[PDB]
Design a protein around this nucleic acid. Structure first.
Ligand SMILES: [Mg+2]
Ligand SMILES: [Mg+2]
Ligand SMILES: [Mg+2]
Ligand SMILES: [Mg+2]
Ligand SMILES: [Mg+2]
Ligand SMILES: [Mg+2]
Ligand SMILES: [Mg+2]
Ligand SMILES: [Mg+2]
Ligand SMILES: [Mg+2]
Ligand SMILES: [Mg+2]
Ligand SMILES: [Mg+2]
Ligand SMILES: [Mg+2]
Ligand SMILES: [Mg+2]
Ligand SMILES: [Mg+2]
Ligand SMILES: [Mg+2]
Ligand SMILES: [Mg+2]
Ligand SMILES: [Mg+2]
Ligand SMILES: [Mg+2]
Ligand SMILES: [Mg+2]
Ligand SMILES: [Mg+2]
Ligand SMILES: [Mg+2]
Ligand SMILES: [Mg+2]
Ligand SMILES: [Mg+2]
Ligand SMILES: [Mg+2]
Ligand SMILES: [Mg+2]
Ligand SMILES: [Mg+2]
Ligand SMILES: [Mg+2]
Ligand SMILES: [Mg+2]
Ligand SMILES: [Mg+2]
Ligand SMILES: [Mg+2]
Ligand SMILES: [Mg+2]
Ligand SMILES: [Mg+2]
Ligand SMILES: [Mg+2]
Ligand SMILES: [Mg+2]
Ligand SMILES: [Mg+2]
Ligand SMILES: [Mg+2]
Ligand SMILES: [Mg+2]
Ligand SMILES: [Mg+2]
Ligand SMILES: [Mg+2]
Ligand SMILES: [Mg+2]
Ligand SMILES: [Mg+2]
Ligand SMILES: [Mg+2]
Ligand SMILES: [Mg+2]
Ligand SMILES: [Mg+2]
Ligand SMILES: [Mg+2]
Ligand SMILES: [Mg+2]
Ligand SMILES: [Mg+2]
Ligand SMILES: [Mg+2]
Ligand SMILES: [Mg+2]
Ligand SMILES: [Mg+2]
Ligand SMILES: [Mg+2]
Ligand SMILES: [Mg+2]
Ligand SMILES: [Mg+2]
Ligand SMILES: [Mg+2]
Ligand SMILES: [Mg+2]
Ligand SMILES: [Mg+2]
Ligand SMILES: [Mg+2]
Ligand SMILES: [Mg+2]
Ligand SMILES: [Mg+2]
Ligand SMILES: [Mg+2]
Ligand SMILES: [Mg+2]
Ligand SMILES: [Mg+2]
Ligand SMILES: [Mg+2]
Ligand SMILES: [Mg+2]
Ligand SMILES: [Mg+2]
Ligand SMILES: [Mg+2]
Ligand SMILES: [Mg+2]
Ligand SMILES: [Mg+2]
Ligand SMILES: [Mg+2]
Ligand SMILES: [Mg+2]
Lengths: 172, 159, 48, 58, 185
RNA sequence: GAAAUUGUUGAAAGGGAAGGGCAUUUGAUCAGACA
RNA sequence: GGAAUACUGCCAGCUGGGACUGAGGACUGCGACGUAAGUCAAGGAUGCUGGCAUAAUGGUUAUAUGCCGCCCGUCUUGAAACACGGACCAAGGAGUCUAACGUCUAUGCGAGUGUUUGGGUGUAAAACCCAUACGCGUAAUGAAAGUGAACGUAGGUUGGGG
RNA sequence: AAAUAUGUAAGAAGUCCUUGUUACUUAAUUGAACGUGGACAUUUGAAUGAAGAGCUUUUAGUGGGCCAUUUUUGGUAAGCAGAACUGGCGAUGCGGGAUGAACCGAACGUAGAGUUAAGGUGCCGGAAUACACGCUCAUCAGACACCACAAAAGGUGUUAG
RNA sequence: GCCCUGAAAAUGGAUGGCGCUCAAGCGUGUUACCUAUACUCUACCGUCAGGGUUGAUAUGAUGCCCUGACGAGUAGGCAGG
RNA sequence: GAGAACAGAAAUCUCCAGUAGAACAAAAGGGUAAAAGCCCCCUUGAUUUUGAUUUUCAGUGUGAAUACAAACCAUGAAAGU
RNA sequence: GGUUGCGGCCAUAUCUACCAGAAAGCACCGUUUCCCGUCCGAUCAACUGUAGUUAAGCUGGUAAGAGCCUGACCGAGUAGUGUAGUGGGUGACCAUACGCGAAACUCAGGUGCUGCAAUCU
């Protein structure tokens, strides 16, 4: 759906005389803007509670920024999604530098591997994996080995003119 | 071939309401109609004399005549691109006083009052109705009510 | 009375464009129609 | 040689050009079809009160 | 495009000149549009339009319909105005004085009016005596007395008179006009 | 003494039709306006 | 603990490059700047300079080049149609006149109106004039014999331009 | 027992006080209907809109229709036959879908400048052989709505779960 | 999920064609860019509407002057030529 | 259902239960319980006059129907019908 | 408060099984000359209110009673549905966006209210 911000969203059903001060519920929501974010909120509250937007109210909406945006983190990611013929729960692991970055590559991944558009996905949880070795998926374990190094073979430089007088070299 | 008699297609319309068959209660006959009164029209299937045609079921018109066992109701019916005036002879069993008017009569009688209550005092009234307005600001407290965080829930089968 | 006084505003097409591939779905689905709340100001300025 | 049998297609377009004219409304509508016994009396009632006004202009 | 809410290029519907070619008519109109553009008197605006009207929309006014109007309370010294022709009426025996301004007076009409020592005035003479139509009573004649309108709205139960040439028993008086012959109207 | 249609002369174009629209190059041709 | 920055938004903040237009034709308005005199970008371009004065610009035409362009007429839901007519060109070639009519309009006269069967007259099919009738209208309604339009300021009520 | 659709009402032709007329009606000057006289003006009784509203005459063409989304009958089905509501085509060019009556965009006076729609931007062809993460290797790969088709089933190909 | 098998028709032949394989393919995201008789501003035509203007001593009063909006079209109607 | 000679699955007699599971010419739908069904009593309103109205509609006709007016009657203690 | 006569709403009033009911009322109840109706004085009619009785009618209370009535974020914002896309999918169908929104279910609470008139420890 885009480049994500993450939002705390807080709502409640409207007050009534016999029930002033209804309970107040919160969701974290990944969206490109607060309009999609409040929308998503109402979308999930209605899967959980007797409410809808006409009888509820948004109390607060705030963007949550990453605590340590230049610290590499190992994310565990938990998703529900629909396929062409059923619906399915999934656990993935994503290594990045923010929840927000991490969720972008998730949708990308879900679109690429499983052909799941944004409508078909529910993020259930995004959590930082504190101890390496609770890291489960090998496509990440791979990047945790000590003194890790790797070359980038077959370098291909972008030409800026249509003709060239050399004959390139993919050295690196 | 086709069939289109008078009471055609009216099986459920003129039907009688669950556990409400039999004699009509006497209040239906004690009610009183005057020319000008506004009435709703709905057929009592157990009262074959003086029945509205089904076109007029659900319809609301004005009394123009009062007769021994009936009232004459004028309904405006639209045919082609125009309305024509229609006059109905209905027995009192197929009619009731419409409340389509009380909110008005009740509002008038009230509107006079707060106008007196103003004038006599020194005006500042404002007595047209107004649509739902949007909500004003408000401050919701957290005390006793910290926000509960919910997330979406996994797929599951039960069956 | 004030608002009716104003002839409807005739605007141009947005100068830097609509920001979306397809206009006719809701703002919330990467379209242009509906309540986009305060994001209207960016659109209308681009159009005015 | 068969042909279409029936359709309302386009009929409400036609009715809306000149428009669906609302019923049109009069102060004093006709007493058409009103109880004759009533009307007979109403006729003398009115006659009576007219007299009593032209009188009051003696 | 515009989703038009009403017909484009629509003419107002009202005459704007008369259809007539008569110089003298056109002169009166020259006079009265001036008066109408510069006096804010409503009388002049009404008179301007009436000058444009076709013959049907200006039935004759009879001199007896004039005598009636002067019988209104406080109206006897008013100068009656008729934007049309004024006709005579032997049915009134006693006709009052006054001043009538009109487009045409038939021979017998100006006679009757003049014999009572009243006065026939043309519309321009009226303009000069009453630039704002002061003290003026405009009369129009019966438009829907015409024979044509007899036949407007013909149809069952409408009571409106056949377009017919010969009349008599045996012209359009049988099946459809009486209970014993098919039905009645 | 028109047109269809034809001969000659002159000019031009022509890789499975021709003719047409918007635009300009090139050739030919020409009105106007300067004072 | 104290800052910076990003992001979003605001300024009746300043300022550079480029393109198209220049309608109007005395003055008159709303303003701006000045202590003032005056000035101005304020109800639509002016200032300065050069070239040509002619096929230079422009029109027309033929051709070339880019892109685009299916035979018209017809009936049809749908025709470029593997539906019909049409090789070509001139010339001819189809809602008319009359009797009686409806609506609308113009004109004359108006409770009337209509001279033109006819007569008179003539510069002779014209123009000019006219007596008696007649036709339509001024009464309706009945199958008919028949009868035949004011209780009232020719009525009351509501709207009604003037 | 919905949703969509649907009747009526939201005032001066209104509301209140006084008490006249009749052959109707009441046991009854009781009522009913129509009135006289009196009291309250634009926050006078929701919103939005209103190149005004009403009304009259007369006359053309037409009376083969067809299509799309949705509802929907008959039929195995049909580019089949038949209804419902709207929107279109017919009667209509223009930009897109290469092509095409009906789809998408958008409805047309003669022109300049600008910006867009739907649809595009390797070359044809105006416009990034742009950026970014994956997936896919086909000895008949695949490539954009309407739309110019493919199914059960099966793979120790590869991917993620 | 993508790919592969399952997958047979008649003139030679069609993701529109060329051709394309870390795509010029499939899913998804982000910018920029191209261009409709549409939208914005302007001129000019015409149509409709609302204003102004008889005061002579010069020339169109059906005129002149200001202002606003609008313009598709078969059958068909009317209008000005 | 439970009961009574001949008498049996079915004859006729009784009590209990019974919202209609019956019946109301006829198709089917609606309606109906001190009834609209069943039994009895009195009857001719299935009559006279001429309008208005609803369905079908052109708001023509015809069929059928509704509610009044003006008669004359039927029935019932009566309201009424 | 009871009760009766006339009622309005017509089950919170109905149904099943028990029990309690003072005073008045109502009831059951005695009778067959008279009006009247029956196969039958059972019903219907009359007569007494005397001779008898709360057994029944009636009224009320009981019951993890059947029914009915009311409520709730009980189920369920579910099913269904109006509007949107050159959304997914061979298709059957299905997600999503802006709205409207049930029924069953589950649980809780209840079991006649009341008008006119007369009468009553
Ligand atoms: Mg049928
Ligand atoms: Mg009957
Ligand atoms: Mg910009
Ligand atoms: Mg820019
Ligand atoms: Mg740009
Ligand atoms: Mg696109
Ligand atoms: Mg702009
Ligand atoms: Mg046939
Ligand atoms: Mg067919
Ligand atoms: Mg047909
Ligand atoms: Mg007449
Ligand atoms: Mg010769
Ligand atoms: Mg050419
Ligand atoms: Mg050229
Ligand atoms: Mg200029
Ligand atoms: Mg100029
Ligand atoms: Mg020259
Ligand atoms: Mg030169
Ligand atoms: Mg040449
Ligand atoms: Mg081409
Ligand atoms: Mg043909
Ligand atoms: Mg055909
Ligand atoms: Mg053709
Ligand atoms: Mg063909
Ligand atoms: Mg043929
Ligand atoms: Mg041929
Ligand atoms: Mg010719
Ligand atoms: Mg002579
Ligand atoms: Mg001669
Ligand atoms: Mg003679
Ligand atoms: Mg006669
Ligand atoms: Mg006689
Ligand atoms: Mg009156
Ligand atoms: Mg509505
Ligand atoms: Mg409506
Ligand atoms: Mg307005
Ligand atoms: Mg207006
Ligand atoms: Mg017509
Ligand atoms: Mg016609
Ligand atoms: Mg016809
Ligand atoms: Mg035909
Ligand atoms: Mg469509
Ligand atoms: Mg056609
Ligand atoms: Mg079109
Ligand atoms: Mg090519
Ligand atoms: Mg290019
Ligand atoms: Mg699809
Ligand atoms: Mg295609
Ligand atoms: Mg696999
Ligand atoms: Mg291919
Ligand atoms: Mg391509
Ligand atoms: Mg892509
Ligand atoms: Mg770029
Ligand atoms: Mg243009
Ligand atoms: Mg413009
Ligand atoms: Mg046109
Ligand atoms: Mg039946
Ligand atoms: Mg009974
Ligand atoms: Mg009979
Ligand atoms: Mg007929
Ligand atoms: Mg009939
Ligand atoms: Mg006792
Ligand atoms: Mg006896
Ligand atoms: Mg006994
Ligand atoms: Mg008894
Ligand atoms: Mg007891
Ligand atoms: Mg009892
Ligand atoms: Mg219970
Ligand atoms: Mg839906
Ligand atoms: Mg779809």
């Amino acid at each position: 759906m885009a480049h994500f911000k993450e939002y705390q969203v807080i709502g409640r059903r409207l007050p009534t005389e016999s029930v002033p001060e209804p309970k107040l519920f919160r969701m974290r929501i990944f969206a490109s803007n607060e309009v999609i974010a409040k929308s998503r909120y109402w979308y999930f509250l209605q899967k959980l509670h007797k409410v809808k937007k006409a009888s509820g109210e948004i109390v607060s909406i705030n963007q949550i920024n990453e605590a340590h945006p230049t610290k590499v983190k190992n994310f565990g990611v938990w998703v529900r999604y629909d396929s062409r013929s059923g619906t399915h729960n999934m656990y993935k692991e994503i290594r990045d530098v923010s929840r927000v970055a991490a969720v972008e590559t998730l949708y990308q991944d879900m679109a690429a591997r499983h052909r799941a558009r944004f409508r078909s996905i529910h993020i259930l949880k995004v959590a930082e994996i504190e101890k390496t070795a609770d890291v489960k998926r090998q496509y990440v374990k791979q990047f945790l080995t000590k003194d890790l190094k790797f070359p980038l073979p077959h370098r291909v430089q972008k030409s800026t003119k249509t003709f060239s007088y050399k004959r390139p070299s993919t050295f690196y | 071939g086709k069939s289109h008699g008078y009471r055609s297609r009216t099986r459920y319309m003129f039907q009688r309401d669950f556990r409400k068959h039999g004699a009509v209660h006497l209040s239906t006959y004690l009610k009183v109609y005057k020319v000008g009164d506004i009435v709703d029209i709905k057929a009592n299937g157990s009262i074959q004399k003086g029945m509205p045609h089904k076109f007029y079921q659900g319809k609301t018109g004005v009394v123009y005549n009062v007769t021994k066992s009936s009232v004459g109701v004028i309904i405006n019916k639209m045919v082609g691109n125009r309305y024509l005036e229609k006059r109905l002879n209905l027995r009192v069993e197929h009619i009731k006083h419409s409340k389509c008017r009380q909110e008005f009569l009740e509002r008038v009688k009230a509107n006079a009052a707060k106008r007196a209550e103003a004038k006599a005092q020194g005006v500042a009234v404002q007595l047209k109705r107004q649509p739902a307005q949007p909500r004003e600001s408000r401050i919701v407290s957290t005390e006793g009510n910290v926000p509960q965080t919910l997330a979406p829930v996994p797929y599951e089968t039960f069956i | 009375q004030a608002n009716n006084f104003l002839w409807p505003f005739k605007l141009s097409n947005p100068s830097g464009g609509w920001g979306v591939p397809r206009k006719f779905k809701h703002f919330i689905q990467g379209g242009s129609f509906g309540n986009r709340e305060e994001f209207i100001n960016k659109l209308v300025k681009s159009m005015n | 040689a068969k042909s279409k049998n029936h359709t309302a297609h386009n009929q409400t377009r036609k009715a809306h050009r000149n428009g669906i004219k609302k019923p049109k409304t009069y102060k004093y509508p006709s007493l058409k079809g009103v109880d004759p016994k009533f009307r007979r009396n109403h006729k003398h009632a009115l006659h009576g009160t007219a007299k009593a006004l032209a009188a009051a202009k003696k | 495009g515009i989703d038009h809410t009403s017909k484009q290029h629509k003419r107002s519907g009202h005459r704007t000149a008369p259809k007539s070619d008569n110089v003298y008519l056109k002169l009166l109109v020259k006079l009265y549009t001036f008066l109408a553009r510069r006096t804010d008197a409503p009388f002049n605006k009404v008179v301007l339009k009436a000058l444009f009207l076709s013959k049907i929309n200006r039935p004759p006014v009879s001199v007896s319909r004039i005598a009636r109007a002067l019988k209104q309370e406080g109206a006897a010294n008013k100068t009656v105005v008729v934007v049309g022709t004024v006709t005579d009426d032997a049915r009134i025996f006693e006709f009052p004085k006054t001043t009538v301004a009109a487009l045409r007076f038939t021979a017998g009409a100006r006679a009757k009016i003049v014999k009572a020592g009243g006065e026939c005035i043309t519309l321009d003479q009226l303009a000069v005596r009453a630039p704002k139509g002061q003290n003026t009573l405009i009369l129009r004649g019966p438009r829907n007395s015409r024979e044509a309108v007899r036949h407007f709205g013909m149809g069952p139960h409408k009571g409106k008179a056949p377009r017919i040439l010969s009349t008599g028993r045996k012209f359009e008086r049988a099946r459809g006009r009486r209970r014993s012959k098919g039905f009645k109207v």
